[PDB]
Design a protein around this nucleic acid. Structure first.
Ligand code: MG
Ligand code: MG
Ligand code: MG
Ligand code: MG
Ligand code: MG
Ligand code: MG
Ligand code: MG
Ligand code: MG
Ligand code: MG
Ligand code: MG
Ligand code: MG
Lengths: 291, 170, 159, 205, 58
RNA sequence: GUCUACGGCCAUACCACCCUGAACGCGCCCGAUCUCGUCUGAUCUCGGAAGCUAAGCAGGGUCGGGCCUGGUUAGUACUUGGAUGGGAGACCGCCUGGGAAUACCGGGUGCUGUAGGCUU
RNA sequence: GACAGAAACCUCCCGUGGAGCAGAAGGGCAAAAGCUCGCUUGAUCUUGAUUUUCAGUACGAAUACAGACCGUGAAAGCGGG
RNA sequence: GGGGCCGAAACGAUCUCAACCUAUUCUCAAACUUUAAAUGGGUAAGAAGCCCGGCUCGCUGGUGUGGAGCCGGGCGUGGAA
């Protein structure tokens, strides 16, 4: 026949991966090259901005590594943008920029450095990077953490990076992966990037689609219709969201609810129960053989 | 009730011509399947050197394409027109994919051209079910489970129920 | 004669333990080393950079210089009839803290607290470690049962 | 044209098997280790007799061959053609060397492979005879006769195990009756209480 | 005229006759081999200790 | 009770098969105008929200394999130091201290950190 | 799965490395140290310290830095064969 | 795959002999190994140690952060044989 490959020797010589690698979550190569602090820095924290794009929202965190685990000093989720005025479209480039701005502003406010480092108050899309002013405390510096995301031009992780840079974080970057960089001739214009930041590509798609056919338009934009946002409000709505974020970044935690203590899973069966189970099965089989 | 997420669909259809040599005939075969599908084919080289076969390593000796969706169904039903919806039971893989081969391509309705010639095709259709992108996506790769797989007999039943074809034993 | 090679005879020394190959865990990199810390050296075959010589494997030294990816440490090496305290530069993956100094630190801080306290009380406290003493006199109760007898068993050629 | 065994009768050098390093070894003279009616079940040959070594020495494949031939011949003459089973439980894996002369001397004296021997510890079994319960004196006589082909000292011991198994003869039949042991040819298979119970019900029905 | 090749017979006695002495230890160890950047800054700190003198005495 | 993002220790976490999943989530899923990339929007990138627990995923189960930890094997094997001990030798016994590994028989089958939800 | 075959090419599944990494062997390695692409010349300039053989001499080889000038990547970083 | 038989043939069937696969079984390895001793090799068992306060830095820094070096003071039951 065929020599079975997964046998006792195979299993007892098998060597498992790390748990996160087995789940497929993280890349330990870049993990080690990114989070390990230089030894003569002597316990100085090293800061990542972890950016994750989900099927329905955007997660941004600031974290530094410790032996027991990673510490997260601040975090901004995209599903709290309606509180600031973005009703729909929570997983696009504009939403990523907004959540990066919210993360940066909340972190600066928590550190007490928000009056300093206003950043790009009025967005323009071109290259910008904050410089530390003398006498005042230095600018907060972190490094991007994209994870397994493929870092190609026009990525929402770079959208969030631009948002936080405008917020006032001193992150090292180049304007090569921003949308607006042309590959063939190697230039970067700020107007295309600003269109993407304002979501004007989405507005143009809405206009195009509603011009040609309305069945596909109602299919593909439906919550947009329910929250009755027209392609014309996009820019002013995003500007209002930016202003609201920059004027109030502090977070309000949801109140802790009282617990009724209902168990939804099944508790682990005990040794006596399973031994009685096997005895019962044996007895039932013997009885069936008897009849 | 059958869950809608368990509807058999053809994931893709792979077409190839292995011509056995390199050059003008290979280019003409490339034009053949480009006309057949509508997309540029890709040339497959040789991994070794087999003297009795007349091929050296790294020599382009095959052409292939893959097609997905509407074009896949159209090409598949054209091939089943060619072989009158008649398949032998051995043509089915234990995974559920299947395939066949045609000796000559003008049976597909494409006009003959004197400067092109005659070529045979290998069709191979691989089926699927909503949720098979799990095994190949990047961010969190996993298996597909035992219930959700595809079986040989139910691949046959799907073929004979939607293409109303006939499966001859042997 | 033998060869003067640098990794001669390290076949089982620099290999990884069973079912512990692969990627090195990050706590080893994340641990920090001040100067003056007592450190155990143990070479690892996964990393070929900054790898100590086979004569310092299993040895213990003292950190004196800390750099970006490695530490400089001072270890005692015995040559023919003299001992040399000499410097090596070892990358972090081949390095651990030693708990021998930690035991002493715990014991000394505990003696310090027990000396500052119980001093105003005026009582005398033993602070040194006397070795294990001979056992003291005690009674063994054979409550009820009599000690059951043992006898050697006869030989049987079970071979 | 081999030397007397008093040369190579001691376990002096390290074990030295035939491998990718030591090539050119001639074949061992002994190559049949099981003989008699080896196609016999476990339930009709309950008596087992061992020839157990007493000294820590080396035995040559020639001696093993001669001893098995003598024992087989006597058993065939005595208990009939197929009323027994002989198993030699030593395989010659040590290869010994000869530094053959003829005037170089001791310069570069590392010998070539000459033959093979088996290294034997104290109490280790050399031969085993499995047969019916009423041929005990025939077995002991055959082993006593085979004793004369070996150097050193050997002992003959009738074992308490059932045939060529690791289970005692006083309780083998009890276990096989209550379905702890499954006969599967010359040996027996042991059934624990740990697998899936599908095997349990298959065995009990 | 072959002769003896290698030996460490009387060597332990020779060594322990004058004894295996632990290496000499002093309270201050030399600053050779340390990081040049670290040493440069430490020498700057030593050089500018003087300018904070009066505050310390007060 | 439980999940998400980032993790620490890296099978008590793996593997095979079966059962169950309330809410949020995580996903499968719907499309290709824009950014982007392919022979192929399959992957990657982008824009969504009609449907779905089918799968991934979480929990549970198997007189489950494996793994972890005990008993036995066993004071056995081996070993520090000693004798004007035995023995033709091969090797062996004792004194002084130390002391294993299979087979076989049991038990267990992830804990945990930071931040953020659900259980109105 | 046409010719097609023991062995050409295509597709799916299993696959802890049972392959490969110039050569001898040993070690090491799986979103890599292997395979395929893109860009390049850290195989460059300079002063010291240290390890290996060792007499703690030399050469050769190697290791941590430091100062320039660069390459690469979005970046952390990595690179003076 | 082979020796055949009924079979024009028939994975239709018969024995087979084989190779294959699955559980077992006898014996091994200086250049094999999951395990794994005894004897053995480092280090520590304080006054150069602990505990406070204050200055310098061109290094490191969200943060007089970190680290290093200096000053001044307090602790003797000399912390196993
Ligand atoms: Mg990467
Ligand atoms: Mg010898
Ligand atoms: Mg001499
Ligand atoms: Mg799609
Ligand atoms: Mg599910
Ligand atoms: Mg389900
Ligand atoms: Mg089990
Ligand atoms: Mg948790
Ligand atoms: Mg309710
Ligand atoms: Mg790589
Ligand atoms: Mg440099």
């Amino acid at each position: 026949f065929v020599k079975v490959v997964k046998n006792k020797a195979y299993f007892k010589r098998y060597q498992v991966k790390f748990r996160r690698r087995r789940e497929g979550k993280t890349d330990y190569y870049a993990r080690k090259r990114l989070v390990i602090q230089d030894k003569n820095k002597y316990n100085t924290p090293k800061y990542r901005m972890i950016v994750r794009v989900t099927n329905r929202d955007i997660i941004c965190q600031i974290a530094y590594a410790r032996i027991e685990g990673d510490m997260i000093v601040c975090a901004a989720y995209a599903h709290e943008l309606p509180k600031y005025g973005v009703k729909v479209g929570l997983t696009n480039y504009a939403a990523a920029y907004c959540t990066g701005l919210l993360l940066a502003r909340r972190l600066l406010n928590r550190f007490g450095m928000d009056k300093i480092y206003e950043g790009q108050v009025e967005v323009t899309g071109d290259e910008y990077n904050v410089e530390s002013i003398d006498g005042q405390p230095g600018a907060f510096t972190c490094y991007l953490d994209a994870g397994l995301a493929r870092t190609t031009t026009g990525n929402k992780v770079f959208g969030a990076l631009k948002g936080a840079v405008d917020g006032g974080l001193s992150i090292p970057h180049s304007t090569k992966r921003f949308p607006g960089y042309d590959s063939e001739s190697k230039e970067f214009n700020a107007e295309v990037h600003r269109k993407h930041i304002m979501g004007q590509n989405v507005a143009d798609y809405m206009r195009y689609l509603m011009e040609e056919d309305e069945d596909a338009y109602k299919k593909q934009f439906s919550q947009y219709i329910k929250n009755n946002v027209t392609p014309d409000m996009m820019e002013e709505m995003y500007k209002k969201a930016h202003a609201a974020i920059r004027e109030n970044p502090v977070y309000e935690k949801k109140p802790k609810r009282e617990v009724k203590k209902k168990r939804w899973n099944r508790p682990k069966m005990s040794l006596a129960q399973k031994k009685d189970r096997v005895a019962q099965k044996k007895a039932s089989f013997l009885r069936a053989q008897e009849r | 009730k059958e869950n809608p997420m368990r509807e058999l669909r053809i994931r893709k259809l792979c077409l190839n011509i292995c011509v056995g040599e390199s050059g003008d005939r290979l280019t003409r075969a490339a034009k053949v399947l480009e006309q057949l599908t509508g997309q540029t084919p890709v040339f497959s080289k040789a991994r070794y050197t087999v003297r009795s076969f007349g091929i050296r390593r790294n020599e382009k000796i095959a052409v292939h394409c893959t097609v997905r969706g509407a074009k896949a169904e159209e090409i598949l039903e054209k091939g089943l027109k060619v072989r009158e919806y008649e398949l032998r039971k051995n043509n089915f893989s234990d995974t559920g994919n299947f395939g066949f081969g045609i000796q000559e391509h003008i049976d597909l309705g494409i006009k003959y051209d004197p400067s092109i010639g005659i070529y045979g095709l290998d069709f191979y259709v691989v089926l699927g079910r909503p949720g098979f992108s799990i095994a190949d996506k990047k961010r969190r790769t996993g298996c597909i489970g035992a219930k959700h797989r595809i079986s040989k007999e139910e691949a046959m039943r799907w073929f004979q129920q939607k293409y109303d074809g006939i499966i001859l034993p042997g | 004669t033998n060869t003067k090679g640098k990794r001669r005879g390290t076949r089982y020394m620099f290999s990884r333990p069973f079912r512990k190959h692969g990627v090195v865990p990050l706590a080893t990199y994340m641990r920090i080393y001040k100067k003056g810390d007592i450190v155990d050296i143990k070479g690892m075959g996964t990393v070929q950079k900054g790898m100590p010589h086979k004569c310092y494997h299993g040895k213990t030294g003292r950190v004196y210089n800390v750099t970006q990816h490695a530490v400089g440490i001072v270890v005692n090496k015995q040559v023919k009839g003299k001992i040399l305290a000499k410097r090596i530069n070892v990358r972090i993956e081949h390095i651990k803290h030693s708990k021998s100094r930690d035991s002493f630190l715990k014991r000394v801080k505990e003696n310090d607290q027990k000396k500052k306290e119980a001093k105003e009380k005026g009582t005398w406290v033993q602070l040194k470690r006397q070795p294990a003493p001979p056992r003291e006199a005690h009674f063994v109760r054979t409550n009820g049962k009599e000690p059951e007898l043992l006898e050697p068993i006869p030989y049987e050629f079970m071979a | 044209g081999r030397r007397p065994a008093r040369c190579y009768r001691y376990c002096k050098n390290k074990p030295y098997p035939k491998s990718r390093f030591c090539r050119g070894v001639p074949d061992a003279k002994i190559r049949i280790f099981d003989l008699g009616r080896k196609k016999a079940k476990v339930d009709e040959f309950p008596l087992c007799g061992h020839m157990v070594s007493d000294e820590y020495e080396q035995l040559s494949s020639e001696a093993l061959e001669a001893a098995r031939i003598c024992a087989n011949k006597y058993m065939v003459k005595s208990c009939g053609k197929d009323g027994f089973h002989i198993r030699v439980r030593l395989h010659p894996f040590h290869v010994i060397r000869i530094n053959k002369m003829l005037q170089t001397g001791m310069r570069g004296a590392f010998g070539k492979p000459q033959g093979t021997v088996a290294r034997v510890h104290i109490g280790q079994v050399i031969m085993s005879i499995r047969t019916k319960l009423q041929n005990k004196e025939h077995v002991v006589e055959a082993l006593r006769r085979a004793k004369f082909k070996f150097p050193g000292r050997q002992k003959i011991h009738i074992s308490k195990k059932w045939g060529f198994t690791k289970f005692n003869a006083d309780e083998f039949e009890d276990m096989v009756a209550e379905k702890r042991l499954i006969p599967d040819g010359c040996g027996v298979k042991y059934i624990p209480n740990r697998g899936p119970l599908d095997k349990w019900r298959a065995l009990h029905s | 005229a072959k002769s003896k090749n290698h030996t460490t017979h009387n060597q332990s006695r020779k060594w322990h006759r004058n004894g295996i002495k632990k290496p000499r230890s002093q309270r201050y160890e030399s600053l050779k081999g340390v990081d040049p950047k670290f040493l440069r800054n430490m020498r700057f700190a030593k050089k500018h200790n003087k300018k904070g003198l009066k505050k310390m005495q007060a």
